[PDB]
Amino acid sequence: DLDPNAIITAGALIGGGLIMGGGAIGAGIGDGIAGNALISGIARQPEAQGRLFTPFFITVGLVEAAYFINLAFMALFVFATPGLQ
Protein backbone atom coordinates (compact mmCIF):
# COMPACT_ATOMS: atom_id res chain seq x y z
CA ASP A 1 0.00 0.00 0.00
CA LEU A 2 2.42 2.67 1.27
CA ASP A 3 -0.27 5.24 2.04
CA PRO A 4 0.85 8.49 0.35
CA ASN A 5 0.22 10.57 3.47
CA ALA A 6 2.64 8.36 5.39
CA ILE A 7 5.41 9.16 2.90
CA ILE A 8 4.49 12.85 3.10
CA THR A 9 4.73 12.78 6.89
CA ALA A 10 8.04 10.90 6.90
CA GLY A 11 9.54 13.37 4.46
CA ALA A 12 8.23 16.32 6.46
CA LEU A 13 9.63 14.91 9.70
CA ILE A 14 13.06 14.37 8.15
CA GLY A 15 12.96 17.87 6.67
CA GLY A 16 12.10 19.37 10.04
CA GLY A 17 14.94 17.39 11.56
CA LEU A 18 17.34 18.86 9.02
CA ILE A 19 15.99 22.39 9.54
CA MET A 20 16.38 22.15 13.30
CA GLY A 21 19.80 20.50 13.14
CA GLY A 22 21.17 23.26 10.96
CA GLY A 23 19.50 25.93 13.07
CA ALA A 24 20.92 24.50 16.29
CA ILE A 25 24.42 24.23 14.83
CA GLY A 26 24.31 27.80 13.58
CA ALA A 27 22.86 29.23 16.78
CA GLY A 28 25.26 27.38 19.06
CA ILE A 29 28.40 28.20 17.10
CA GLY A 30 27.48 31.84 16.51
CA ASP A 31 26.50 32.49 20.11
CA GLY A 32 29.67 30.77 21.29
CA ILE A 33 31.85 32.92 19.04
CA ALA A 34 30.10 36.15 20.02
CA GLY A 35 30.42 35.20 23.68
CA ASN A 36 34.10 34.43 23.17
CA ALA A 37 34.57 37.94 21.82
CA LEU A 38 32.58 39.40 24.72
CA ILE A 39 34.53 37.46 27.35
CA SER A 40 37.87 38.46 25.86
CA GLY A 41 36.82 42.10 25.67
CA ILE A 42 35.63 42.14 29.28
CA ALA A 43 38.80 40.37 30.40
CA ARG A 44 40.94 43.06 28.79
CA GLN A 45 38.85 45.92 30.19
CA PRO A 46 36.77 45.86 33.40
CA GLU A 47 34.25 48.56 32.51
CA ALA A 48 33.99 47.59 28.83
CA GLN A 49 31.01 45.34 29.64
CA GLY A 50 28.46 48.15 29.52
CA ARG A 51 29.29 49.21 25.97
CA LEU A 52 30.21 45.72 24.75
CA PHE A 53 26.78 44.30 25.56
CA THR A 54 25.28 46.46 22.81
CA PRO A 55 27.14 44.88 19.85
CA PHE A 56 26.95 41.49 21.56
CA PHE A 57 23.18 41.85 21.80
CA ILE A 58 23.04 42.81 18.12
CA THR A 59 24.98 39.69 17.16
CA VAL A 60 22.93 37.44 19.45
CA GLY A 61 19.75 38.85 17.96
CA LEU A 62 20.97 38.37 14.40
CA VAL A 63 21.84 34.73 15.13
CA GLU A 64 18.86 33.79 17.29
CA ALA A 65 16.44 35.35 14.80
CA ALA A 66 17.87 33.11 12.09
CA TYR A 67 17.49 30.12 14.40
CA PHE A 68 13.91 30.98 15.35
CA ILE A 69 12.94 31.47 11.70
CA ASN A 70 14.05 27.87 11.17
CA LEU A 71 12.04 26.96 14.28
CA ALA A 72 8.91 28.51 12.80
CA PHE A 73 9.39 26.84 9.43
CA MET A 74 9.99 23.45 11.04
CA ALA A 75 6.71 23.95 12.88
CA LEU A 76 5.18 24.67 9.48
CA PHE A 77 6.75 21.50 8.06
CA VAL A 78 5.56 19.11 10.78
CA PHE A 79 2.15 20.67 11.52
CA ALA A 80 0.94 22.20 8.23
CA THR A 81 2.84 20.17 5.67
CA PRO A 82 2.90 21.83 2.23
CA GLY A 83 1.78 19.55 -0.57
CA LEU A 84 -0.03 17.13 1.74
CA GLN A 85 -3.16 15.69 0.12
Next chain:
Amino acid sequence: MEVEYVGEVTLYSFEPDPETLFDALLPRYIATRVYAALLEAAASES
Protein backbone atom coordinates in the same frame (compact mmCIF):
# COMPACT_ATOMS: atom_id res chain seq x y z
CA MET B 1 69.65 44.74 37.02
CA GLU B 2 68.36 42.89 40.06
CA VAL B 3 64.58 42.53 39.84
CA GLU B 4 62.86 44.47 42.62
CA TYR B 5 59.41 43.18 43.59
CA VAL B 6 57.30 45.95 45.09
CA GLY B 7 54.20 44.48 46.70
CA GLU B 8 51.28 46.06 44.83
CA VAL B 9 49.60 49.35 43.97
CA THR B 10 42.86 47.24 32.64
CA LEU B 11 46.10 45.49 31.78
CA TYR B 12 48.18 46.75 28.88
CA SER B 13 48.24 45.14 25.44
CA PHE B 14 51.66 44.43 23.94
CA GLU B 15 52.48 44.34 20.23
CA PRO B 16 53.84 41.97 19.02
CA ASP B 17 54.46 40.35 22.41
CA PRO B 18 55.78 41.53 25.79
CA GLU B 19 59.01 39.54 25.48
CA THR B 20 60.19 41.26 22.29
CA LEU B 21 59.27 44.68 23.67
CA PHE B 22 61.17 43.99 26.90
CA ASP B 23 64.20 42.82 24.91
CA ALA B 24 64.15 45.95 22.75
CA LEU B 25 63.54 48.20 25.76
CA LEU B 26 66.20 47.04 28.23
CA PRO B 27 69.14 48.36 26.14
CA ARG B 28 67.25 51.62 25.68
CA TYR B 29 66.75 51.88 29.44
CA ILE B 30 70.45 51.27 30.04
CA ALA B 31 71.34 53.94 27.48
CA THR B 32 68.92 56.36 29.15
CA ARG B 33 70.48 55.72 32.57
CA VAL B 34 73.96 56.22 31.12
CA TYR B 35 72.79 59.50 29.58
CA ALA B 36 71.36 60.58 32.92
CA ALA B 37 74.69 59.78 34.57
CA LEU B 38 76.58 61.78 31.93
CA LEU B 39 74.30 64.80 32.39
CA GLU B 40 74.53 64.47 36.17
CA ALA B 41 78.33 64.40 35.93
CA ALA B 42 78.32 67.44 33.64
CA ALA B 43 76.29 69.43 36.16
CA SER B 44 78.62 68.27 38.94
CA GLU B 45 81.67 69.29 36.91
CA SER B 46 80.30 72.78 36.35
